[PDB]
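Why predict the complex rather than its parts? Because the way molecules touch one another can change local conformation, and only a joint prediction can capture that. The input here totals 930 residues.
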Amino acid sequence: KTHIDYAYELDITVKPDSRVPVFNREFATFTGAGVPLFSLGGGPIRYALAEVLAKFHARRGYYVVETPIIASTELFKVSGHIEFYRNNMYLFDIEGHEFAVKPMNCPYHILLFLNEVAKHRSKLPLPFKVFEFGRVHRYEPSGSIYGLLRVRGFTQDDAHIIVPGGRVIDVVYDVFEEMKLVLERLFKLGVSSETFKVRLSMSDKSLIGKEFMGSKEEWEGAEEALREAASRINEKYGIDIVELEGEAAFYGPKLDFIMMVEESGVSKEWQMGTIQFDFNLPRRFRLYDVVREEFGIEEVYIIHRALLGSIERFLGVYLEHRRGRMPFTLAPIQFAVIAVKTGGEVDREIEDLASSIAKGLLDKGFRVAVKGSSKTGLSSDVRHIESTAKPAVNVFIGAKEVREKVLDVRVFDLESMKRRRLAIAYGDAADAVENLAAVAEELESPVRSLSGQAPRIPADFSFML
Amino acid sequence: KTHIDYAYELDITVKPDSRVPVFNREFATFTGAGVPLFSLGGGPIRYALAEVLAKFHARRGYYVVETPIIASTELFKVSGHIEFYRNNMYLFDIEGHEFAVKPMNCPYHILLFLNEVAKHRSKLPLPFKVFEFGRVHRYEPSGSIYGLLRVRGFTQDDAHIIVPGGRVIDVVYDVFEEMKLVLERLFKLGVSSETFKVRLSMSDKSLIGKEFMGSKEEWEGAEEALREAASRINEKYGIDIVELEGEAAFYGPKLDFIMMVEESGVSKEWQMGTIQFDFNLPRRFRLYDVVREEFGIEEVYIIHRALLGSIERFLGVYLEHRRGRMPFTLAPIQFAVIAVKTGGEVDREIEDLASSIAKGLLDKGFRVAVKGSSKTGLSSDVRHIESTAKPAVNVFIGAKEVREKVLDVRVFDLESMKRRRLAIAYGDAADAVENLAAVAEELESPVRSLSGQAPRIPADFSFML
Ligand SMILES: [Zn+2]
Ligand SMILES: [Zn+2]
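Output of the joint prediction:
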């Protein structure tokens, strides 16, 4: 099982080689290869993620923005390079004039900086930090396309930071803290000396002025910022730091976030976001001038960062590493309510309790699937549900639950990779719903600390079970 | 003053003819005409709107989805028409194969329907209702472009509904109820017999089979559904109904939502969303077959609906009709905290109170701007703020507020178009923040009823004042 299987099973995406009813042709012969089509299970995950990541960044001091999806190629001519980059871009014509489907957000984010400088000059605080849940498109050859990992259109948790020399170490370190918070609290992935690695890619000093552009002062200023931040990371968590001479991009040095994971029992890297310094953009958009003239600042840095990276790619690796198991906030189905019918008259109270709990949870904003089952069918109903829908929380309602007034409630424990059984007492349906909602609130609690609010985007996904 | 002015002043968008610092060229010579660039004030409005509209639709029973931005033109060949529509589309090549930047969501939404039918057949409920905050691009000539009203890329509160004959009247009526809820609760616009009109556009029966496609049964079934729903609307609200023979689109009849507004003192229409029946799509995507074969249903309807329509367009007209005044949830600046310094030692308590209230509101997730002012400067500081930033709530902190322990708090009343003064007692900073937060919660209350949660996307916009 790959993410491709898990994505189809949880109904996060449409499978490109599934046949369209009545047409019998693959969905991909309508949509194009490499264009992931998110489905009904995937919709709420995408809104929820945007919402959490936007609020998380706003609480950490980033200005959240949404930038256009197309642009004149003048925009990408000014940024560079552009005889090269042209080749990864989808271009088109309006009306003689050349336009592109945006392959990156950076130029737009710098325009927004430039617009605020123009209106407010030095009243604008620095560091200036702008975040976007941004939608980018790039040329990928048909043979390069693979599931959700390499695609033609995808989303990034993209940010740009314009930071003076005196605050740059703290900003780098903070982004690391951001990565760690999102991993631990949204995804329930532990970040520590045993699971995480930071990789620095630096210049070769002999080649500054040629394969690495810019001046020595630039490179040393940035490389030292990455070494100091990395040194604080290592001191606080014992996370190990790797440094590669001559691996930087031509426009500045960088840091990569790497999770260490294991098969089965193979040790592997799972590469995530990045902190990329840029010496090209501040020249091409005259940022050095602007910051010197308006703020009197001579040492400033420009930085691209993503915590997850490509969101599709992150979700893909995540589906595989976690075998389809989503954190509660992002689970297509949050509560699966399972009525275990017996044949007898107790079925009426079972069916009323299940139905009422189901409506109550939906009113509270949860994603809920009701499944009718039986004592003899239960075993194979559950097996089907666990192998496919993987609901975050199963609630079993049988004769026993009705007579004892205790729900049988099974939350999936992401660390142990096992269900854990809770016995939740209730007086009546209303009260069962309150108590289930309380459990959910405990499961949403880490996300509330990132973003203030856990998103409730309700749905009745009964038809999936 | 047009929306173009209000949008620039509230920092919702970048003005295309503003000059880029240091370059002195217009922003538009980088971006392209007709491509609205939302700015820092506009970012949180866009996330907030997506979030509220998505949750509102999920609570009303729509499945929320996000569909790709590009697609093979096979997708638009199957839907029609396509020698015609080709001309409004941005097209491009991958790798020999023709692709388009999506001009509409409909084909994608039908693929998602078809995908669920394939996996779950008749377990899928009907009506099937899918909602998307969707991003669409269309060719518009340079002379057609105007502000936010006619643009090249824009967003819709788009939905598709596949409804059997027996439930179609209720669905039409419900969409109307949706329009009314969003207007009244998100936008604080009254919808009644004095302010609202519903326009039906129908076939000419003599031309069914020619300028209006489909069969008589189709048209009569749909036109009666619109007349019955309209008749219920009129009975419940006395809203007047207008019916035009021969104005329907070639593929089915429709209903348009129209607000009646006034200058100055001219009566004008403000056209909003639509309910469009479609007889073409169910043929082109073989939906009639699919619904008959899988559900045994012979009478079914396919419907496109938007409540706002183009979101950019709606926001534009809104900015003009309300002279820049946003509802609290959508206001770029939610609380403006204004320290009225005196020169004396009381300035220390004024500055500490303002500062603490400001940090406290930010922690609660609000968008906050602090302005330092003086007794002599106040008058012209406020005038500048009211003419430009238009904060939802002004909080004045002067010597008097400190000595009496009562804040001077001015909420803008959207109906009367005037500030209204509240006297809010406090014991200390913490308590002032609780009491301000309570006022905000009262202002967020109508949005909580649409969507369960009012979005808090915080920002420090001090630099704007
Ligand atoms: Zn970038
Ligand atoms: Zn449509």
